[PDB]
DNA sequence: AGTAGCACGTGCTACT
DNA sequence: AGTAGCACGTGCTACT
């Protein structure tokens, strides 16, 4: 019957929607701005998006800084090895 | 009437849900894994969560590496300035 | 044939 | 008094 066909479809929908609620919970706890405080689904999506843009830019600049200091370490190590050839 | 009260509540719900659909679109485009390809809402929430854990760890190690090279640049710059005092 | 996924509707709580 | 937000239901498309 229809009441049997609906109850089965409704059951499969709740179990799938409980997995989504768990994912919002996990995502909300992944953003330090929303961690521990009850936030709406609109805020979780938007803040995580802003936080991903922040992490990508900050990780990009840090990678640039690592390359700078490595090149600077290379010129310094070579200048020590050269100055150590003198007396 | 009820049909008037429902239509107004349904209208406010669609406009709010269209903003959430826009946020999933923005979030999906923030993850390089899901960018450009049609992904479900369960995947957007889970992959962004995995990508945030990845960015936080990789940004933490890069910050650690910047501190190492800076301390190493400091000992190298000092060793050059000392060796430059000789002849 | 069965279902994942989503648009849309609905009624309630808890706010403003 | 009005509504944001959510749990839950419902019917369809598009897959397996």
């Amino acid at each position: 019957h229809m009441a049997d066909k609906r109850a089965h479809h409704n059951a499969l929908e709740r179990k799938r929607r409980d997995h989504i609620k768990d994912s919002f919970h996990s995502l909300r706890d992944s953003v330090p701005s929303l961690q521990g405080e009850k936030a709406s689904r609109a805020q979780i999506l938007d803040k995580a998006t802003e936080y991903i843009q922040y992490m990508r830019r900050k990780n990009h600049t840090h990678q640039q800084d690592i390359d700078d200091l490595k090149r600077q370490n290379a010129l310094l190590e070579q200048q020590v090895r050269a100055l150590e050839k003198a007396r």
Side-chain angles (χ1 to χ4, degrees), chain A residues 2-4 6-34 36 39-51:
Chain A
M2 299 193 186
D4 301 333
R6 288 198 190 100
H8 180 67
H9 171 61
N10 298 344
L12 302 175
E13 200 68 20
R14 293 190 304 265
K15 183 176 179 180
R16 194 191 61 88
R17 277 163 168 171
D18 273 295
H19 293 358
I20 283 182
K21 188 196 304 179
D22 296 331
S23 296
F24 271 108
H25 186 89
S26 303
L27 186 57
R28 144 178 160 258
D29 291 335
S30 293
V31 174
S33 171
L34 315 171
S40 70
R41 299 192 168 192
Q43 291 167 323
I44 294 167
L45 297 173
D46 294 337
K47 287 305 176 60
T49 301
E50 303 177 18
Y51 184 59

Side-chain angles (χ1 to χ4, degrees), chain A residues 65-76:
Chain A
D65 299 337
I66 292 184
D67 301 329
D68 294 325
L69 300 178
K70 279 183 169 182
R71 278 185 294 271
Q72 191 165 353
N73 270 321
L75 300 179
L76 288 173

